[PDB]
A = this chain, B = another copy of it.
């Protein structure tokens, strides 16, 4: 119908969306695609006289292209173009409201997934973006030429604030750049946030003074209200520490954007955790792919973002890691990049890999993500038989051995086990880590 316009030339100011559409039986792709377009824009069930007070064509979403999905006889990618004027400047909230607010409940569809968005420069330039971004962060921390290393403190709940800070000091002093608050750790009966912030600050400053290297702890500012979130960031600011944390999907985009602005204004790095993402991004037929949530974070603002474990599909991960880090990313269907994306010098976000990784993963992780990444342990440090500081040292040594080998021209994919084995000869900490975890 009138919302399927296959001859439309997209404008350089349009927001474009690629939807994976699964229509009900009997519903051709073209009116499914047209329904997505009309339902996520100007479509309404009966005619109305106020339409004649404007030019509706100027606000129509249009489905301008449809292609089949490989391996499916009832799934299509439908491309939809939305005019720039639909969107409130600087608001990820309004961008999602306008595009995914209504159409996922349409009855003629069995399922619907948003795969990708083309964010035009005219729109992305209305956002702050990362408080600092990759390059500024490396300069502030004086850290170059290797992935950054972190550890999440466990048990997440259980410890007193003091015992919690003790574990942080021991991790940091052994060679990790950062320690982190579990996503669940906000403020709770046996560890109130302000107590935790004081002891973690003592730990950060003790470990930095001991090692000579800059240290941080991702202090979780996630809270029930905006007022509490900002109170937490304000105290971190008072303590002079370098980095805070936010759970951006459960706290939400309005709060995240507020926090990103506060962090820009006060020189704080912002570590973003993606709790609840798999509620939305797991199933191939319905929801939103994480690369959409990743672009939205880059716009709303964060300096780090959790990006997986890669220990999903390699090519898809590599795809949205480029979308997070790079200035210009060309369309590349093999890597899940449905649109060419130009960020016109908005800083990039450092991807963070976490979840069940130990020293034997270091070659693969270094090879996959390269230097601009955070490798985040949590079990792989606190599970070392000699304790946290040696566990940290084992991970730092393994990483630096991989970086040295890579820089020398050695292939990490083929020689990683040998690289690690050679380092075990002079690092008893690494040797010990290598016999507990096996491969």
Contact = CB atoms under 8 A, between A and B. Distances in A.
A434 to B, nearest CB: 14
Q: How many copies does the complex hold?
A: 3
Interface in A175-221: 183-184, 186-190, 192, 194-195, 198-199
B136 A250 contact: no
A188 B158 contact: no
Interface in A88-103: 88-94, 96-98, 100-102
Contacts of A92: 224
Interface string A157-170: 11111110001000
Interface stretch (A64-72, A276-284, A397-405, A421-429): A276-284
A247 interface: yes
B155 A51 contact: yes
A203 to B, nearest CB: 13
Contacts of A334: none
A145 interface: no
Interface range on chain A (Cβ under 8 Å from partner): 35 or more
A106 to B, nearest CB: 8
A159 B54 contact: yes
B275 A102 contact: yes
Contacts of A6: none
Interface stretch (A28-36, A365-373, A377-385, A411-419): A377-385
Interface of A: 12-13, 42, 44-51, 53-56, 58-59, 84-94, 96-98, 100-102, 104-105, 111, 114, 121-123, 125-126, 132, 135-136, 139-140, 153-163, 167, 183-184, 186-190, 192, 194-195, 198-199, 222-225, 231, 247, 250-252, 264-265, 267, 275-279, 282-283, 344-347, 356, 378-380, 382-383, 387, 437
Those 7 A-B pairs whose CB atoms lie nearest each other, nearest first = A91-B224, A54-B158, A101-B275, A105-B278, A139-B162, A46-B383, A104-B278
